Amino acid sequence: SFTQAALTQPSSVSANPGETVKITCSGGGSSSNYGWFQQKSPGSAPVTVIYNNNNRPSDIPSRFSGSKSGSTATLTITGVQADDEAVYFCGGRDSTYAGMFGAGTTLTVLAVTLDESGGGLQTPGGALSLVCKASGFTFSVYDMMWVRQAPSKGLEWVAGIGITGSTYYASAVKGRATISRDNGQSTVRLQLNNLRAEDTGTYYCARGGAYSINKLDTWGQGTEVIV
Amino acid sequence: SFTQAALTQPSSVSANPGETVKITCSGGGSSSNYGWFQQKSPGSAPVTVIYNNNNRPSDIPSRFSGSKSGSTATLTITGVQADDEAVYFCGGRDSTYAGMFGAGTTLTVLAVTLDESGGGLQTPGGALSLVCKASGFTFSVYDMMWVRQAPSKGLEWVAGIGITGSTYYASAVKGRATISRDNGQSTVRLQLNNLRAEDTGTYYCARGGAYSINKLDTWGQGTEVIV
Ligand SMILES: [Cl-]
Ligand SMILES: [Cl-]
Ligand SMILES: [Cl-]
Ligand SMILES: [Cl-]
Ligand SMILES: [Cl-]
Ligand SMILES: [Cl-]
């Protein structure tokens, strides 16, 4: 718990389209081999791009290749495309019978919008603060609201705010929630305290209504909250 | 908490490609209006397809239309495509200042694979059982393993099983985990007890190695576990 050992790989690498990118990883047991796994977003499942140092799965383009040299391995992507943007995890094993990963290398390849943040792990009885940053429109003339969705459940209205600052809250969160807006920063904020397990879920900000869900024309991508 | 009121919409509707589908929803305050939101998978953010009874956002095809009649509204999709498969939520407001949703209507439009299930919400100190169902290959001749990923963290090896039944566990779960396989049912099972918050995350089954992550050529889609 207070100790960890992982494979070493770089945090990030940037490339223009069409370039050849190489990412190297080191560590693992002395005779170990290596694989590489692509995860295009934290919510998508990894896929293998290279296994056993240098083999491609059938569904992977030939522009992906790999090699091993000693206790290092290298992933090469020729002709990088925007679609190749992802975190690439190396994996292998230690000198014992345990699997090991690297921390992952993020590959970066060099309109009305709403962007939520502030979620993550939370303690029962604790509090959270979510913020949505809007852009691409006159923020001050729109009502805004938050909607959430518990794991394997439907959409639930949480709170909303009108253009004169009137606020409205769902019974589920009454007494514990505060929604506010900062027209200068084009942000809306949702504070929620005395967290319960029922507060767990994905939280979306959306534009157009405060309590009138029918007026919503634009949704953020959400932020996950786990109590 | 022991009471709920929502808009009424049907659980599901099935259609062949090219058909015109209509889904109707009822309820809400007497003068309320309605919107419709598409969610293609529980992990993707909703998007508005209709708002204010009958308006389409600019990025939505004209094959989507809506109408309101009294305290009912209807979503129509002409020329349904496979890509239209999704849950469609209606939304509006009550007679008071609160937003309301329906439970959502699932639209159904009429190889080596691994499919995990058994996750969801869990209580600290409780236990869980995840199962992966394999198909498309001779299951009994492959090593299999589970990997997890905590919110906003990297991949972590959990446990693996070889073709002779040898099992291997990460230190994080030693004493609390049991991995098993049923070659007859092409399933692998991960039991985990005395759950801690650190056990929260998405859990993947993958084919090819028990502790040798480099041998993995195929990944499941994952199952989420929240303690
Ligand atoms: Cl070794
Ligand atoms: Cl207002
Ligand atoms: Cl409103
Ligand atoms: Cl009314
Ligand atoms: Cl074995
Ligand atoms: Cl192995």
Coordinates of C-alpha atoms and ligand atoms in Angstrom, one line a residue:
Chain A
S1 CA 0.0 0.0 0.0
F2 CA 2.8 2.4 0.9
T3 CA 4.9 0.8 -1.7
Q4 CA 4.5 0.4 -5.4
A5 CA 6.6 -0.8 -8.3
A6 CA 5.5 -0.4 -12.0
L7 CA 7.0 -0.4 -15.4
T8 CA 8.5 3.0 -16.5
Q9 CA 7.0 4.8 -19.5
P10 CA 6.9 8.5 -20.3
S11 CA 3.8 10.6 -19.4
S12 CA 3.2 12.0 -22.8
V13 CA 4.3 12.4 -26.4
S14 CA 3.0 14.8 -29.0
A15 CA 3.0 14.4 -32.8
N16 CA 1.7 16.0 -35.9
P17 CA -0.4 14.0 -38.2
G18 CA 1.7 11.7 -40.5
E19 CA 4.6 11.4 -38.1
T20 CA 6.2 8.2 -36.7
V21 CA 6.0 8.1 -32.9
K22 CA 8.0 5.8 -30.7
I23 CA 7.3 5.2 -27.0
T24 CA 9.7 3.2 -24.8
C25 CA 9.0 1.4 -21.6
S26 CA 11.4 -0.4 -19.1
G27 CA 11.3 -2.7 -16.2
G28 CA 9.8 -6.1 -15.4
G29 CA 11.5 -9.4 -14.6
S30 CA 14.7 -10.0 -16.4
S31 CA 13.3 -12.4 -19.0
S32 CA 9.9 -10.8 -19.3
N33 CA 8.2 -9.8 -22.5
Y34 CA 5.8 -6.8 -23.2
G35 CA 2.5 -5.8 -24.5
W36 CA 0.9 -2.5 -25.4
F37 CA -2.7 -1.5 -24.8
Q38 CA -4.6 1.5 -26.2
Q39 CA -7.3 3.3 -24.2
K40 CA -8.9 6.1 -26.2
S41 CA -10.7 7.5 -23.2
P42 CA -10.9 6.5 -19.6
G43 CA -14.5 5.2 -20.1
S44 CA -13.6 3.0 -23.1
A45 CA -12.2 -0.5 -22.7
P46 CA -8.5 -1.1 -23.5
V47 CA -7.6 -2.9 -26.7
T48 CA -4.4 -4.7 -27.4
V49 CA -2.3 -3.1 -30.1
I50 CA 0.9 -5.2 -29.6
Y51 CA 1.4 -8.4 -27.6
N52 CA 4.4 -10.7 -27.0
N53 CA 6.8 -7.8 -27.8
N54 CA 6.0 -7.6 -31.5
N55 CA 2.7 -9.3 -32.5
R56 CA -0.3 -7.4 -33.7
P57 CA -3.9 -8.7 -33.2
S58 CA -5.7 -9.3 -36.5
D59 CA -7.8 -6.1 -36.2
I60 CA -4.8 -3.8 -35.7
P61 CA -3.3 -1.8 -38.6
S62 CA 0.2 -2.6 -39.7
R63 CA 1.3 1.0 -38.8
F64 CA 1.5 -0.4 -35.2
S65 CA 4.7 -2.3 -34.4
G66 CA 6.7 -3.3 -31.3
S67 CA 10.1 -4.5 -30.3
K68 CA 11.9 -5.6 -27.2
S69 CA 15.5 -4.9 -26.2
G70 CA 16.7 -6.2 -22.9
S71 CA 14.4 -4.9 -20.2
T72 CA 13.0 -2.2 -22.5
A73 CA 10.3 -2.3 -25.2
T74 CA 9.3 0.2 -27.8
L75 CA 5.9 0.8 -29.4
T76 CA 6.1 2.4 -32.9
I77 CA 3.2 4.0 -34.7
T78 CA 4.0 5.2 -38.2
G79 CA 1.8 7.6 -40.0
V80 CA 0.0 8.7 -36.9
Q81 CA -3.7 9.8 -37.3
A82 CA -5.9 11.9 -35.1
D83 CA -7.8 8.7 -34.3
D84 CA -4.6 7.3 -32.7
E85 CA -4.9 9.7 -29.8
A86 CA -5.1 7.7 -26.6
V87 CA -3.2 6.6 -23.5
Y88 CA -0.9 3.6 -24.3
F89 CA -0.2 1.3 -21.4
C90 CA 2.7 -1.1 -21.5
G91 CA 2.3 -4.4 -19.6
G92 CA 4.5 -7.3 -18.6
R93 CA 5.3 -9.2 -15.5
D94 CA 7.7 -9.2 -12.6
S95 CA 10.4 -11.7 -11.6
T96 CA 7.7 -13.3 -9.6
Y97 CA 4.2 -14.4 -10.7
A98 CA 2.6 -11.0 -10.9
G99 CA 1.5 -8.8 -13.8
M100 CA 2.8 -5.3 -14.1
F101 CA 1.7 -2.2 -16.0
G102 CA 3.2 1.1 -16.7
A103 CA 1.4 4.3 -15.8
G104 CA 0.5 5.0 -19.5
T105 CA 1.8 7.4 -22.1
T106 CA -0.7 9.9 -23.4
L107 CA -0.4 10.5 -27.2
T108 CA -1.5 13.9 -28.3
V109 CA -1.9 14.5 -32.0
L110 CA -1.3 18.2 -32.7
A111 CA -19.4 26.1 -31.2
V112 CA -21.6 26.0 -28.1
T113 CA -19.9 23.9 -25.4
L114 CA -20.3 23.0 -21.8
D115 CA -17.5 21.4 -19.7
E116 CA -18.1 19.8 -16.3
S117 CA -15.4 19.1 -13.7
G118 CA -15.0 18.5 -9.9
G119 CA -16.1 14.9 -9.6
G120 CA -14.3 11.9 -8.4
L121 CA -14.2 9.9 -5.2
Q122 CA -16.0 11.3 -2.2
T123 CA -16.6 10.5 1.5
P124 CA -20.1 9.9 3.0
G125 CA -21.0 13.1 4.9
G126 CA -18.4 15.0 2.9
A127 CA -19.2 17.7 0.3
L128 CA -18.5 18.2 -3.4
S129 CA -18.3 21.1 -5.8
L130 CA -18.9 20.7 -9.5
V131 CA -18.4 23.5 -12.0
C132 CA -19.4 23.7 -15.6
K133 CA -17.6 26.2 -17.9
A134 CA -19.8 27.3 -20.8
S135 CA -18.6 28.9 -24.1
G136 CA -19.9 29.8 -27.5
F137 CA -22.9 31.8 -26.4
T138 CA -24.3 34.7 -24.3
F139 CA -24.3 32.8 -21.0
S140 CA -26.2 35.3 -19.0
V141 CA -29.4 35.0 -21.0
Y142 CA -29.8 31.2 -20.6
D143 CA -31.3 29.2 -17.7
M144 CA -29.0 26.3 -16.7
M145 CA -29.5 23.0 -14.8
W146 CA -27.8 19.9 -13.5
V147 CA -29.0 16.4 -14.1
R148 CA -27.6 13.2 -12.7
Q149 CA -27.7 9.5 -13.5
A150 CA -26.9 6.8 -11.0
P151 CA -25.2 3.6 -12.2
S152 CA -27.7 1.6 -14.3
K153 CA -30.5 4.1 -13.7
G154 CA -32.3 6.8 -15.6
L155 CA -31.9 10.6 -15.7
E156 CA -32.8 12.6 -12.6
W157 CA -33.1 16.3 -12.4
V158 CA -31.0 17.8 -9.6
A159 CA -31.2 21.6 -9.6
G160 CA -31.5 24.6 -11.9
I161 CA -30.9 28.3 -12.0
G162 CA -32.8 31.0 -14.0
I163 CA -31.5 34.2 -15.6
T164 CA -32.5 36.3 -12.5
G165 CA -30.8 33.9 -10.2
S166 CA -33.9 32.0 -9.1
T167 CA -32.8 28.5 -7.9
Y168 CA -34.7 25.3 -7.8
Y169 CA -33.8 21.9 -6.3
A170 CA -35.0 18.4 -6.5
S171 CA -36.4 16.9 -3.3
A172 CA -33.6 14.3 -3.3
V173 CA -31.1 17.1 -2.6
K174 CA -33.1 19.8 -0.9
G175 CA -31.3 21.3 2.1
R176 CA -28.0 19.9 0.8
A177 CA -27.5 21.6 -2.5
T178 CA -26.6 25.0 -3.7
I179 CA -26.6 26.0 -7.4
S180 CA -25.0 29.3 -8.4
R181 CA -23.8 31.1 -11.6
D182 CA -21.0 33.5 -12.3
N183 CA -22.0 35.3 -15.5
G184 CA -18.6 36.9 -15.7
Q185 CA -16.8 33.6 -15.8
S186 CA -19.6 31.8 -17.8
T187 CA -19.7 29.1 -15.0
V188 CA -22.4 27.4 -13.1
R189 CA -21.6 25.6 -9.8
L190 CA -23.3 22.9 -7.9
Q191 CA -22.4 22.3 -4.3
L192 CA -23.7 19.3 -2.6
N193 CA -23.1 18.4 1.0
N194 CA -23.7 15.6 3.5
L195 CA -23.2 13.1 0.6
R196 CA -25.1 9.8 0.6
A197 CA -24.6 6.7 -1.5
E198 CA -27.6 7.8 -3.5
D199 CA -25.7 10.8 -4.7
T200 CA -23.3 8.5 -6.6
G201 CA -23.5 8.9 -10.4
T202 CA -22.6 10.9 -13.5
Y203 CA -23.6 14.6 -13.3
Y204 CA -24.4 16.7 -16.4
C205 CA -24.8 20.4 -16.9
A206 CA -27.3 21.4 -19.6
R207 CA -28.4 24.6 -21.2
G208 CA -31.9 26.1 -21.6
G209 CA -34.1 25.4 -18.6
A210 CA -33.9 25.7 -14.8
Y211 CA -36.7 23.3 -13.9
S212 CA -38.2 22.9 -17.5
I213 CA -36.3 19.9 -18.9
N214 CA -38.1 20.4 -22.2
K215 CA -36.1 23.6 -22.9
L216 CA -32.7 21.8 -22.9
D217 CA -30.9 22.0 -26.2
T218 CA -27.3 21.3 -25.2
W219 CA -25.6 18.9 -22.7
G220 CA -22.1 18.7 -21.2
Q221 CA -20.1 15.4 -21.3
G222 CA -20.6 14.8 -17.6
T223 CA -18.5 14.4 -14.6
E224 CA -18.5 11.2 -12.5
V225 CA -19.1 11.3 -8.7
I226 CA -18.5 8.3 -6.5
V227 CA -19.4 8.4 -2.8
Chain B
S1 CA -37.7 8.5 -1.0
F2 CA -40.5 6.0 -0.6
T3 CA -42.5 7.9 -3.3
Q4 CA -41.7 8.8 -6.8
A5 CA -43.6 10.3 -9.7
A6 CA -42.2 10.4 -13.3
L7 CA -43.4 10.8 -16.8
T8 CA -44.8 7.6 -18.4
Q9 CA -43.1 6.1 -21.4
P10 CA -42.8 2.6 -22.7
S11 CA -39.9 0.4 -21.8
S12 CA -38.9 -0.6 -25.3
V13 CA -39.8 -0.5 -29.0
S14 CA -38.2 -2.6 -31.7
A15 CA -38.0 -1.7 -35.4
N16 CA -36.4 -3.0 -38.6
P17 CA -34.2 -0.7 -40.5
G18 CA -36.0 1.8 -42.6
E19 CA -39.1 1.9 -40.5
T20 CA -40.9 4.9 -38.9
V21 CA -40.9 4.5 -35.1
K22 CA -43.1 6.5 -32.7
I23 CA -42.8 6.6 -28.9
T24 CA -45.3 8.4 -26.8
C25 CA -44.9 9.8 -23.2
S26 CA -47.5 11.3 -20.8
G27 CA -47.7 13.3 -17.6
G28 CA -46.2 16.5 -16.3
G29 CA -48.0 19.7 -15.3
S30 CA -51.1 20.5 -17.3
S31 CA -49.5 23.2 -19.4
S32 CA -46.0 21.6 -19.6
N33 CA -44.0 21.0 -22.7
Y34 CA -41.7 18.1 -23.6
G35 CA -38.2 17.3 -24.8
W36 CA -36.5 14.1 -25.9
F37 CA -32.9 13.0 -25.2
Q38 CA -30.9 10.2 -26.8
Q39 CA -28.4 8.2 -24.8
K40 CA -26.7 5.6 -27.0
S41 CA -25.1 3.8 -24.0
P42 CA -25.2 4.4 -20.3
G43 CA -21.6 5.7 -20.4
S44 CA -22.2 8.3 -23.1
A45 CA -23.7 11.8 -22.4
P46 CA -27.3 12.4 -23.5
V47 CA -28.0 14.6 -26.4
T48 CA -31.1 16.5 -27.2
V49 CA -33.0 15.3 -30.3
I50 CA -36.2 17.3 -29.7
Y51 CA -36.9 20.3 -27.4
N52 CA -39.9 22.4 -26.8
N53 CA -42.2 19.7 -28.1
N54 CA -41.1 19.9 -31.8
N55 CA -37.8 21.7 -32.3
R56 CA -34.7 20.0 -33.5
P57 CA -31.2 21.2 -32.5
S58 CA -29.1 22.1 -35.5
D59 CA -27.0 19.0 -35.4
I60 CA -30.0 16.6 -35.4
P61 CA -31.2 15.0 -38.7
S62 CA -34.7 15.9 -40.0
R63 CA -35.9 12.3 -39.6
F64 CA -36.4 13.2 -35.9
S65 CA -39.6 15.0 -35.1
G66 CA -41.9 15.6 -32.2
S67 CA -45.3 16.8 -31.3
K68 CA -47.4 17.5 -28.2
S69 CA -51.0 16.7 -27.6
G70 CA -52.5 17.6 -24.3
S71 CA -50.4 15.9 -21.6
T72 CA -48.8 13.6 -24.1
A73 CA -45.9 14.0 -26.5
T74 CA -44.7 11.8 -29.3
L75 CA -41.2 11.3 -30.7
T76 CA -41.1 10.1 -34.3
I77 CA -38.0 8.8 -36.1
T78 CA -38.5 8.1 -39.8
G79 CA -36.2 5.8 -41.7
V80 CA -34.6 4.3 -38.5
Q81 CA -31.0 3.4 -38.8
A82 CA -28.9 1.0 -36.7
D83 CA -27.1 4.1 -35.4
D84 CA -30.4 5.3 -33.8
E85 CA -30.3 2.5 -31.3
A86 CA -30.4 4.2 -27.9
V87 CA -32.5 4.8 -24.8
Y88 CA -34.8 7.9 -25.5
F89 CA -35.8 9.8 -22.4
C90 CA -38.7 12.2 -22.4
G91 CA -38.4 15.2 -20.1
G92 CA -40.7 18.1 -18.9
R93 CA -41.7 19.6 -15.6
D94 CA -44.4 19.2 -13.0
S95 CA -47.1 21.6 -11.9
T96 CA -44.6 22.9 -9.5
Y97 CA -41.1 24.1 -10.1
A98 CA -39.4 20.7 -10.6
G99 CA -38.1 19.0 -13.7
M100 CA -39.4 15.5 -14.6
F101 CA -38.1 12.7 -16.7
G102 CA -39.5 9.4 -18.0
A103 CA -37.8 6.1 -17.3
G104 CA -36.6 6.0 -20.9
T105 CA -37.6 3.9 -23.9
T106 CA -35.0 1.5 -25.4
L107 CA -35.1 1.4 -29.2
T108 CA -33.8 -1.8 -30.6
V109 CA -33.1 -2.0 -34.3
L110 CA -33.7 -5.6 -35.5
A111 CA -15.6 -13.6 -33.5
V112 CA -13.7 -14.0 -30.3
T113 CA -15.7 -12.2 -27.5
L114 CA -15.5 -11.7 -23.7
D115 CA -18.5 -10.4 -21.7
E116 CA -18.2 -9.3 -18.1
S117 CA -21.1 -8.8 -15.6
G118 CA -21.9 -8.7 -11.9
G119 CA -20.8 -5.2 -11.0
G120 CA -22.7 -2.3 -9.6
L121 CA -23.1 -0.8 -6.2
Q122 CA -21.5 -2.6 -3.3
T123 CA -21.2 -2.1 0.5
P124 CA -17.8 -1.8 2.4
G125 CA -17.1 -5.2 3.9
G126 CA -19.5 -6.8 1.5
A127 CA -18.5 -9.1 -1.3
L128 CA -18.9 -9.3 -5.1
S129 CA -18.9 -11.9 -7.8
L130 CA -18.0 -11.0 -11.4
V131 CA -18.3 -13.4 -14.2
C132 CA -16.9 -13.3 -17.8
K133 CA -18.5 -15.4 -20.5
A134 CA -16.2 -16.2 -23.4
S135 CA -17.0 -17.3 -26.9
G136 CA -15.5 -17.8 -30.3
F137 CA -12.5 -19.9 -29.1
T138 CA -11.3 -23.0 -27.4
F139 CA -11.6 -21.6 -23.9
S140 CA -9.9 -24.3 -22.0
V141 CA -6.5 -23.8 -23.7
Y142 CA -6.1 -20.1 -22.8
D143 CA -4.9 -18.4 -19.6
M144 CA -7.3 -15.7 -18.4
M145 CA -7.0 -12.7 -16.1
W146 CA -8.8 -9.7 -14.5
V147 CA -7.5 -6.2 -14.7
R148 CA -9.1 -3.2 -13.0
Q149 CA -9.0 0.6 -13.3
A150 CA -9.9 3.0 -10.5
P151 CA -11.5 6.3 -11.4
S152 CA -9.0 8.6 -13.1
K153 CA -6.2 6.0 -12.6
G154 CA -4.2 3.5 -14.7
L155 CA -4.6 -0.2 -15.3
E156 CA -3.9 -2.6 -12.4
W157 CA -3.6 -6.4 -12.5
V158 CA -5.9 -8.2 -10.1
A159 CA -5.7 -11.9 -10.6
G160 CA -5.2 -14.6 -13.2
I161 CA -5.7 -18.3 -13.9
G162 CA -3.8 -20.7 -16.0
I163 CA -4.9 -23.7 -18.0
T164 CA -4.1 -26.2 -15.2
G165 CA -6.0 -24.1 -12.7
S166 CA -3.0 -22.3 -11.1
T167 CA -4.2 -19.0 -9.7
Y168 CA -2.3 -15.8 -9.0
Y169 CA -3.4 -12.7 -7.1
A170 CA -2.2 -9.1 -6.8
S171 CA -1.0 -8.0 -3.3
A172 CA -3.9 -5.5 -3.3
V173 CA -6.4 -8.3 -3.1
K174 CA -4.5 -11.2 -1.6
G175 CA -6.6 -13.0 1.0
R176 CA -9.8 -11.5 -0.3
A177 CA -10.0 -12.7 -3.9
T178 CA -10.8 -16.0 -5.6
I179 CA -10.5 -16.5 -9.4
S180 CA -11.9 -19.7 -10.9
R181 CA -12.8 -21.0 -14.3
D182 CA -15.6 -23.3 -15.6
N183 CA -14.3 -24.7 -18.9
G184 CA -17.7 -26.3 -19.5
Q185 CA -19.5 -22.9 -19.4
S186 CA -16.5 -20.9 -20.9
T187 CA -16.7 -18.7 -17.9
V188 CA -14.2 -17.2 -15.5
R189 CA -15.3 -15.9 -12.1
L190 CA -13.7 -13.3 -9.8
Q191 CA -14.9 -13.2 -6.2
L192 CA -13.7 -10.4 -4.0
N193 CA -14.7 -10.0 -0.4
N194 CA -14.2 -7.5 2.4
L195 CA -14.6 -4.7 -0.1
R196 CA -12.7 -1.4 0.4
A197 CA -13.1 1.9 -1.4
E198 CA -9.8 1.1 -3.2
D199 CA -11.7 -1.8 -4.9
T200 CA -13.9 0.7 -6.7
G201 CA -13.4 0.8 -10.5
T202 CA -14.0 -0.8 -13.9
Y203 CA -13.1 -4.5 -14.1
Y204 CA -12.0 -6.2 -17.3
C205 CA -11.5 -9.8 -18.2
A206 CA -8.8 -10.5 -20.8
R207 CA -7.5 -13.5 -22.7
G208 CA -4.0 -14.9 -23.0
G209 CA -2.1 -14.6 -19.8
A210 CA -2.6 -15.4 -16.1
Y211 CA 0.2 -13.1 -14.7
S212 CA 1.9 -12.3 -18.0
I213 CA 0.1 -9.1 -19.2
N214 CA 2.2 -9.2 -22.4
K215 CA 0.2 -12.2 -23.6
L216 CA -3.1 -10.4 -23.7
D217 CA -4.7 -10.3 -27.1
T218 CA -8.4 -9.7 -26.3
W219 CA -10.2 -7.6 -23.7
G220 CA -13.8 -7.5 -22.5
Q221 CA -15.8 -4.3 -22.3
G222 CA -15.6 -4.2 -18.6
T223 CA -18.0 -4.1 -15.7
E224 CA -18.2 -1.2 -13.2
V225 CA -17.9 -1.8 -9.5
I226 CA -18.7 0.9 -6.9
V227 CA -18.1 0.4 -3.2
Ligands
CL1 CL 12.5 -13.4 -14.7
CL2 CL -35.0 33.5 -12.9
CL3 CL -37.3 26.6 -16.5
CL4 CL -49.0 23.6 -15.0
CL5 CL -1.6 -23.4 -15.1
CL6 CL 0.9 -16.1 -17.6

